[PDB]
Ligand binder design. Structure first.
Ligand SMILES: c1ccc([C@H]2COCCN2c2ccnc3n[nH]cc23)cc1
Length: 157
């Protein structure tokens, strides 16, 4: 996929029987549940950015973050591609709290609110729950419509 892309992180706190998601309270995608994360800044590593966003958005720090996927997004009419680095953790160091950006809630793994999530999540979340690593690409028209996609499992994220 040609063109400049912008680095983002997405963090799923996935415990044996539940996953933490946040309701995005402002900005692009407000009104959907998603993992924690955001744009990576100058002067931090991608994993540093993931930790920063998780702390800002939920108050949580973690022992370890594990690379589980990469997703490229194209939004029709937007010049910049999104290059999203997906991480998983089961080593949180506190209780999540609401932020300006995100309202956190735990969901049982059979009650993941896919209808109130980005539509791509329905495709890759199952791979995450199955502990498979993946590469995805999703081309969106607006926020609701996936026009094209690819998804595969990988050995190296
Ligand atoms: C980290 C990275 C991205 C996002 C959100 C909101 O920012 C715009 C792009 N986002 C998404 C687009 C497409 N599919 C998504 N799944 N989960 C999140 C998605 C939240 C947190």
């Amino acid at each position: 996929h040609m063109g400049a892309s912008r680095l983002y992180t997405l963090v799923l706190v996935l415990q044996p029987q539940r996953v933490l998601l946040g309701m995005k309270k402002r900005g692009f995608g407000a009104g959907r549940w998603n993992g924690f994360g955001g744009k990576v800044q100058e002067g931090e590593t991608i994993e540093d950015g993931a930790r920063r966003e998780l702390q800002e958005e939920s108050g949580l720090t973690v022992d370890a973050l594990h690379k589980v996927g990469q997703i490229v997004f194209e939004f029709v009419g937007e010049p910049e591609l999104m290059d999203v680095h997906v991480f998983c953790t089961d080593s949180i160091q506190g209780t999540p709290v609401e932020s300006d950006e995100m309202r956190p809630c735990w969901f049982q793994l059979d009650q993941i609110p896919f209808k109130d999530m980005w539509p791509d999540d329905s495709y890759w979340f199952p791979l995450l729950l199955q502990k498979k690593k993946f590469h995805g690409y999703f081309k969106f028209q607006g926020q609701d419509t996936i026009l094209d996609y690819t998804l595969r499992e990988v050995d190296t994220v």
